């Protein structure tokens, strides 16, 4: 259960909607794809790295803070910074879920929280009739973000030693491949470090009555009613595209998929599972919903 | 007459007979007693009998209405009355005058008087749903008449806003006793000053809110070619859906509409009765409404609906439990919000494989299906409503129209002609209107929307505005009615004056409402109307109000959803007031200074080392600007502060 | 399966200018210092190698519109000063970049109309880094020919605005190739 923390040097788009959109953070299951498909494009067994490993969402840093999202209990007082505020940092993350932290404090975290800056790089297509014929150029967009030097992404992952091994190599293999969004275009390499904070792994050895939920999951059919006794959630519509399943791009896309949020709190605890959203396909297309759980 | 509407029109007028006097129980009924429409006996009964004095000997039935409106004037609220008595803005004792030692006059209630008679002569008539006119004639007619003219009291409160508030509080009052199996009202209320207060402590209202869900992500996924098109419409469009859905509620509650205190963003308050059915009828709706939406939408939109249970006691500011009660329904709507959807609810969601085709370039969304030329239908009918936005400006509520409304209905868009047509037709019509007003046609409904109509946008946020609408004047006058008046002021400014002011500025309107200012247009006029905006604000919330602004320049072509998400004294007497004007002067006086050498200006500026001092001091020399404007340059240069002030002044300059 | 690595250096004989924000210059909304997206280096590459020709660009660059998936076999990423030229810069006290100042001449008329257009300065070096995934053992040596002769051809060409009026002119050195993924050897292959 070790977690990995990533460098890049260059902005990746990550993005939600379209291509001149950006983020900062992406959920387990496009880490989940990527590390599947470099998997595949090494081509090694996947059953292992299928049905055995339990990853996190990835969550930004800083020059030496790491952070966690923001649990969404009910507090009972200010109501208008809590709302504006998204991640804590591990300090006082277990003061903010008691109540220590305060409106001014809040004020002083999100004053810090200056991890990475968002831009929108232009660019023009020339394959067009603009070059063959009479005919015009075509702009486009792209959304990206610059984190700090020191500045980046983690994530925390739990499994077997065996599991973590082949994590550690296909993690490697990937490092120079992208993630995020246009890859190929010059976004998106990354130095990756394996750092243990003792701090952070308290967190995630504490006991508790209520989870937070750290990733993107959601129950199966027949975990759901009793998984949803009393819980504080948000859904997230996961949709998008495949990538050398089909015939036509264009005609391939896995359909609109729903999971909670990675703020929810749950009293009871549920395992997810790796869901099929294939249909039309000449394989099996994976999104990812297994938990992992901080106790308290 | 449905005695509920007996109650509604007699207590619409209770406290009508001041503006007579000002031109009292007694005043009100002789003047009503001389007309053709209303002349109902039960109706007069309510304005003759509406104070304690005239209740005493007044002999009525154990069940009157008359007693449901004296109640309704209490909870709403040594005497010598000055009917010179400006009305006086709330604003200022918010964080502590109309028409500045400013005094009303006697000839113009009696202005008010013929104009009041004349209406009342052409324009009003009674009948089973006739109520919402004669509201609507009251707010137009009363809006600065003040209500109570007590010296010794913080005069602050419209008579149009004291019989709005009367008349809602009625109306619960009688639905509440009706369904309680109470008709003697005399002895259930009157028999006992201990009685009338335990009825106080009795709960008998709920406070209902409603939320929409998805305010941003739907507003705000906009990338096609249409840009102002599909904006202007969005926001209208998500804004009247707001408004039918209410509109449906408050008939369902067979409620007045009166009973609406405020809507905004997504908000919108209301206050209804407390009985069983009630609570079933809410339970119905509510579930309805998750059905539409979710058959709609899923995820981009949703309703959530809270209410809590108070008696008016609490809303006499009795102990400030009023804003308790806010505070508990505000954290409610947060907890129905948390609970969206059920076990089910969900198990269909992930369970709907469906041959769909792909994004509609306007609306970016794939889950809805697209016909032809990659276009879909809801998004086609958006586009339909743009067009028609600007030149007409009546909205009908109709089974066959062009955009898809949550209860089964769909909107459509008229001439004023039409709209009368409709009357004689006598169709199941509702009026939405580009802010009319004066109109009486039919459900003539005068709802509130701003439609006015590189590149620069502007967004700005009231900063103290969740303090204000809650805490707002600390425990002397946080009355619901009071509270409702300045929630119904602001309403009135940011709806009414954001069409006013705009005349003068290359502005459309995108976005108004609640605390929400989202405008676009070109940059210098973009920055000239925000800073406009900003004085005229301070001048109508006498400074007691601020609001944060941000200014973003922007390509054109650019998808705006990708730009709203990008987005005073000091830079208005400093930057442009000084610097601007003599920069201007300057390059106007002296000519080929083009934006090389201001660019080199630049340079020398942007690279902040002492050697670059003196480059910028040589680079002045050889230009031939008089003396003095230079050497103001260089001392502005080397100031840290002024340098800053400079480089933006000049980098407006271009 | 194994990828191979590509770094070096590139040196602006004569001024460069990409100017996403345009008259600008690419940069970083926060370092200020010029930078050079590789997608355009990848534009400029694939309209030469096609222009010298069509399935070997579909392999090296990957377009997956007529239905045949093949998926990118290049990875070429944007570029940076390296601290080399920082330090010279700051050392020597030598501006970054450059504003030329350009004119045009109306005919019929003969009036002057004023341009500026910024352009990197000369002699600066990119640090580049490319990223070759050999799916195919028995093409690598093929497909490195193919980019060698794209590198070449981008040797005598220019990059960006104004290449025809005189910019862009750029060269390659200390370019070293090595194996990253994989137990693929890269002793024998050669790009200059």
Redesign the interface.
Known sequence: TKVFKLSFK?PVHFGK??L??GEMTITADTLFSALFIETL???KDTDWLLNDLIISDTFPYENELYYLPKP?I?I?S???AFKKLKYVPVHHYNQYLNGELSAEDATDLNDIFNIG?F?????VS?IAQE?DSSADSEPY?V?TF?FEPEAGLYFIAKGSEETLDHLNNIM??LQ???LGG??????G?FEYEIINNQQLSKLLNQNGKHSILLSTA?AK?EE??S??KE???????R?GFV???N????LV?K????SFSSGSVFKNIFNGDI?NVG?NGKHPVYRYAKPLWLEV | MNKKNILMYGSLLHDIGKIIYRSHSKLGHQFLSQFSEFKDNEVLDNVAYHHYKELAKANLDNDNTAYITYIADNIASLFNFDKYTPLYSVFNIVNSKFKENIQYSSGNYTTLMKDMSHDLEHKLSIKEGTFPSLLQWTESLWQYVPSSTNKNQLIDISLYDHSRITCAIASCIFDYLNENNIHNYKDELFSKYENTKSFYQKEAFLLLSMDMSGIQDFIYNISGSKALKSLRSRSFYLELMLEVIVDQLLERLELARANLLYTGGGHAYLLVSNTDKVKKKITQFNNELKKWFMSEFTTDLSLSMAFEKCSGDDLMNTSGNYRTIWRNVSSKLSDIKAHKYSAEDILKLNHFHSYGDRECKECLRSDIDINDDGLCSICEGIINISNDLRDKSFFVLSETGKLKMPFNKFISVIDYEEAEMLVQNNNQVRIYSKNKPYIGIGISTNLWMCDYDRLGVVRADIDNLGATFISGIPEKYNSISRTATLSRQLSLFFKYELNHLLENYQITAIYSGGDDLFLIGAWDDIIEASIYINDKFKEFTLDKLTLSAGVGMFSGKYPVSKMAFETWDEFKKNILEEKLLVLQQGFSQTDEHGKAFIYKMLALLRNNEAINIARLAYLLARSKMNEDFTSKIFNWAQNDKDKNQLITALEYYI | YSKIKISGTIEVVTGLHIGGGGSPVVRDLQTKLPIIPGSSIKGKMRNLLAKHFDERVLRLFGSSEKGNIQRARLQISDAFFSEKTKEHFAQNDIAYTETKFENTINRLTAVANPRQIERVTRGSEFDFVFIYNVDEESQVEDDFENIEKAIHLLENDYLGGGGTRGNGRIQFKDTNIETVVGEYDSTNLKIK
């Open positions: 260059t909607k379209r001149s959109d494009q090494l081509g969404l009910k009972d200010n109501h208008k800056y831009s929108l790089q232009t660019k020339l070059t967009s959304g610059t490697t293999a120079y491949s992208g246009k890859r190929n275009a010059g976004y390499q959601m059919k759901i009613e998984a949803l819980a504080r959630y948000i859904l997230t519509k949709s990538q050398s399943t015939y036509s791009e264009m896309k359909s609109d998929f729903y869901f249909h």
